[PDB]
C-alpha cells in the first residue's frame, strides 16, 4: 500500500540522511534524451534515494503507466507518479499502479480541482506532493491545507529557473508542511543550503539519469 513518501522524508530528516527524490525521465522539456533501464535505475536508487518520482507522461516525458507499474514492483521505496493530474481517475491509476502519492501542480488546476484532488488523494491514504511556483500557488496550497508542498524552481510555462523566488516561498511555508524543493538542484552545496532553509526533500532527475552515481555525492 501507500508508503508515505513524506514520512520517509520525515525519517530521513531524523536520520540525518539527504531525502532526495530521484526522478526517472528519459525525455524532458529541459534535458536531453537519455534512455536508461527503469529497473536498473530504480534498483540502484532504492539503495540510496528517499523515493522515486516517475513520469508516466508519454508525450513530453516519454514515460508509461507500465514503466511506473514495473518500477513500483521492483522497489520497496515510496513512489510518486509525476504526471499532470487533473482528474480523480489518475489518482486511481496512480494508486492501482504503484504510486504512494501523486503530483498536483497548483498552476494548471483550479482551486476547486486541486482541493478535491487533494481530498481524493487522502481518501486513498496518499498525501499528494503539491507543486507550487509563485506567491499565488503557495497561497492556494496553503488555502487547501497542504501538508506536503513541492516548490518548483522551474516554471512549466517558460522553463525558467528562479531559484531566488523558489527559496522565498520556502520561507513562507509553515514548518509543519514537508517541503520538497524540486528542479535546479545541481550540487550538495545548495542541498545543505535549502536544507537550512527548511526544505526536507529534494526532487532531482536529469543529473541522476545522466549519471545516477551522482546521488552518492548528494547524500553527504
UniProtKB/Swiss-Prot annotation:
Keyword Transcription regulation set for record: no
Catalytic activity: 1-(2-carboxyphenylamino)-1-deoxy-D-ribulose 5-phosphate + H(+) = (1S,2R)-1-C-(indol-3-yl)glycerol 3-phosphate + CO2 + H2O
Pathway per the UniProt entry: Amino-acid biosynthesis; L-tryptophan biosynthesis; L-tryptophan from chorismate: step 4/5
EC number: 4.1.1.48
Protein name per UniProt: Indole-3-glycerol phosphate synthase
UniProt-recorded Gene Ontology molecular function terms: indole-3-glycerol-phosphate synthase activity; phosphoribosylanthranilate isomerase activity
Quaternary structure note: Monomer.
Organism: Saccharolobus solfataricus (strain ATCC 35092 / DSM 1617 / JCM 11322 / P2) (Sulfolobus solfataricus)
A GO BP annotation: L-tryptophan biosynthetic process
NCBIfam families documented for this protein: PRK00278.2-1
Class of this enzyme: lyase
Gene: trpC
Pfam families assigned: IGPS
Keywords, ordered alphabetically: Amino-acid biosynthesis, Aromatic amino acid biosynthesis, Decarboxylase, Lyase, Tryptophan biosynthesis
Family: Belongs to the TrpC family.
Coiled-coil ranges per UniProt: none
Alphabetical list of SUPFAM superfamilies matching this protein: Ribulose-phoshate binding barrel
PROSITE patterns registered for this protein in UniProt: IGPS
Amino acid at each position: 500500500p501507500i508508503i508515505s513518501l513524506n514520512e520517509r522524508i520525515l525519517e530521513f530528516n531524523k536520520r540525518n540522511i539527504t531525502a532526495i527524490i530521484a526522478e526517472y525521465k528519459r525525455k524532458s522539456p529541459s534535458g536531453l534524451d537519455v534512455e536508461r533501464d527503469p529497473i536498473e535505475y530504480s534498483k540502484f536508487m532504492e539503495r540510496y534515494a528517499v523515493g522515486l518520482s516517475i513520469l508516466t507522461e508519454e508525450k513530453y516525458f516519454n514515460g508509461s503507466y507500465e514503466t511506473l507499474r514495473k518500477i513500483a514492483s521492483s522497489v520497496s521505496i515510496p513512489i510518486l507518479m509525476k504526471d499532470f493530474i487533473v482528474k480523480e481517475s489518475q489518482i486511481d491509476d496512480a494508486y492501482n499502479l504503484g504510486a504512494d502519492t501523486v503530483l498536483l501542480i497548483v498552476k494548471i488546476l483550479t482551486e476547486r480541482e486541486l482541493e478535491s484532488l487533494l481530498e481524493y488523494a487522502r481518501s486513498y491514504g496518499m498525501e499528494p506532493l503539491i507543486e507550487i511556483n509563485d506567491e499565488n500557488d503557495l497561497d492556494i496550497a496553503l488555502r487547501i491545507g497542504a501538508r506536503f508542498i513541492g516548490i518548483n524552481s522551474r516554471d512549466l510555462e517558460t522553463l525558467e529557473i528562479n531559484k531566488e523566488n523558489q527559496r522565498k516561498l520556502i520561507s513562507m511555508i509553515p514548518s509543519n508542511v514537508v517541503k520538497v524543493a524540486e528542479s535546479g538542484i545541481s550540487e550538495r552545496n545548495e542541498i545543505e543550503e535549502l536544507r537550512k532553509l527548511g526544505v526536507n526533500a529534494f526532487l532531482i532527475g536529469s543529473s541522476l539519469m545522466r549519471n545516477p552515481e551522482k546521488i552518492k555525492e548528494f547524500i553527504l
